Write a protein that binds this ligand. Structure first.
Ligand SMILES: N[C@@H](CCC(=O)N[C@@H](CSSC[C@H](NC(=O)CC[C@H](N)C(=O)O)C(=O)NCC(=O)O)C(=O)NCC(=O)O)C(=O)O
Length: 508
């Protein structure tokens, strides 16, 4: 009937949002089949009620009480049919699995809860308690102005406690991870490796049945094929088009091309705990060495902007008075000389193996940086690994310097600065291994304030500090594209980059 064909560039790492932390996986699971307690309005960073119908917050900002929606049905599959509606047990399960190392599901699928860790929920959460069947009370150890928006994030999707109970009893608990059951607008209808995953409209969805009956995420790895299929009408949406095809699609009558400035940053991270990158003068030098304009031209082809802060220009708290390091090989050489490296040195540049939102060609970007560094005496080899291995090694601190990128997930500047630069996230999401007590104090103070204007002043100061300490080269903020077929109606890009299809329709 009404089948939306979404052509995606890679197979998902997994279908359990608590266990992963990448957009392909989220798009193929939590964005379609799960709900959160609160969710973002489409195309917006504003939050609204979802599985929590309403809530209250205590005056001290430490106690959040959630009144849960009644009448909410979970999906079924061949292995499980729910015998009760969504309730507090499902919320408690979803938190406690991650929070409690001795929860029965903590080690199922060898789970590691990467985003739960980067968000520091283990130290944030004092308790998550069932008050009654339709009421959950969460107590915090400290104030967090971003907590409600954070509860809209995919990693804290609400799973089925009944499903978990049944699958554990049957001796196959991993089933809840590979074979998702949620309350969300679409339900999981199977995955064929390196071919496609399928979804169906959840007819009993609590907010009303979706206008699209069937969804297919067809895995079409070749960008050239994705474009050809879109033109033939075999795709209704594609990701990451090739540059030359993108140029054509801007004025292609068969394409409705959506675009928006990305809430993201592509960067070179320096391992600030590893000589010679532990010398701030070296990190500043390698900034001066790089011609970002040349990267915008060659890599982004103009679809992006040279970055001056790790925050994107379109988020609040962005510091407009900050300038990037100017392109000056002369200044780079002088600093390298002062650092004791007039004769330069040898190093590696780590190259990200897959394309993500913020950078359409990590390898070409690395080649350009490599060339720039060569001009100031810094010679390098490019080093890469398969995606999972690349990130694991990076987190362990094996990198020297490397290409990475980040898209924000809750609309708040804290969700850039804390995951990326907070000392507590070294080994998690802070690849530069940056530990700066002055920054930590700024971020800790800001996150708890209710006065947004004051939060903004603090983040602005934080950006001054980050420029001076140069844990990174801020490279670019990209443009997000969503090329669609002409029959797609009412589609909206997510501010965070996700493909969210509830509320989209298909014309005749
Ligand atoms: N905050 C974490 C987890 C969230 C995350 O993975 N976000 C996605 C964007 S939403 S997931 C969608 C994204 N696709 C896009 O970026 C294409 C444009 C899109 N169609 C739109 O209209 O905005 C994608 O496929 N990405 C593949 C991947 O995440 O591995 C991402 O690409 N972040 C990394 C970055 O910005 O460099 C992170 O950034 O790594």
């Amino acid at each position: 009937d009404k089948t939306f064909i979404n052509c995606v560039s890679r197979s998902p790492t997994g279908f359990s949002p608590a266990l992963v932390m990448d957009g392909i996986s989220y798009n193929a699971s939590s964005q379609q089949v799960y709900n959160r307690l609160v969710e973002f309005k489409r195309g917006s960073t504003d939050i609204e009620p979802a599985l929590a119908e309403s809530w209250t917050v205590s005056d001290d900002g430490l106690t959040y009480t959630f009144n849960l929606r009644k009448g909410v049905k979970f999906h079924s599959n061949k292995e499980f049919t729910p015998s009760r509606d969504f309730n507090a047990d499902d919320v408690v399960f979803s938190f406690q699995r991650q929070l409690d190392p001795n929860h029965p599901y903590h080690n199922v699928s060898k789970a590691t809860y990467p985003y739960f860790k980067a968000m520091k929920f283990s130290t944030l959460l004092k308790s998550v308690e069932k008050v009654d069947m339709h009421t959950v009370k969460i107590t915090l150890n400290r104030q967090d102005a971003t907590f409600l928006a954070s509860l809209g994030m995919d990693f804290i999707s609400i799973y089925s406690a009944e499903y978990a109970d049944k699958m554990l009893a049957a001796g196959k608990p991993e089933t809840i991870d590979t074979t998702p059951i949620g309350t969300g607008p679409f339900l999981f209808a199977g995955y064929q490796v390196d071919q496609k995953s399928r979804y169906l409209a959840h007819k009993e969805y609590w907010k009303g049945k979706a206008d699209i009956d069937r969804l297919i995420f067809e895995i079409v790895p070749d960008a050239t094929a994705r474009y050809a299929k879109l033109q033939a009408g075999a795709c209704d949406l594609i990701d990451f088009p090739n540059a030359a095809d993108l140029e054509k699609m801007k004025t292609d009558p068969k394409v409705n091309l959506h675009s928006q400035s990305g809430l993201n940053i592509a960067y070179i991270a320096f391992n600030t705990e590893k000589a010679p990158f532990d010398n701030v003068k070296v990190r500043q030098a390698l900034n001066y060495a790089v011609d970002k304009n040349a990267i915008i031209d060659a890599v982004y082809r103009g679809a992006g902007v040279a970055a001056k802060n790790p925050l994107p220009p379109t988020i609040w708290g962005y510091n407009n008075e900050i300038t990037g390091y100017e392109y000056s090989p002369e200044k780079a050489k002088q600093l390298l000389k002062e650092a004791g490296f007039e004769n330069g040195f040898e190093t590696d540049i780590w190259v990200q193996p897959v394309v993500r939102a913020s950078n359409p060609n990590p390898r070409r970007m690395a080649e350009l940086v490599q060339s720039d560094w060569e001009k100031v005496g810094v010679k390098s080899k490019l080093v890469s690994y398969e995606w999972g291995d690349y990130i694991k090694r990076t987190k362990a601190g094996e990198l020297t310097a490397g290409t990475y990128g980040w898209s924000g997930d809750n609309g708040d500047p804290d969700n850039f600065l804390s995951p990326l630069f907070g000392s507590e996230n070294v080994g998690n999401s802070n690849y530069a291994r940056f530990k700066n007590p002055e920054l930590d104090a700024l971020l800790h103070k800001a996150v708890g304030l209710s006065d947004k204007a004051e939060r903004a002043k603090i983040y602005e100061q934080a950006q001054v500090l980050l420029k001076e300490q140069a844990p990174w080269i801020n490279v670019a903020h990209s443009i997000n594209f969503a090329p669609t077929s002409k029959r797609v109606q009412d589609y909206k890009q997510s501010p965070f980059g996700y493909t969210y299809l509830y509320g989209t329709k298909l014309a005749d």
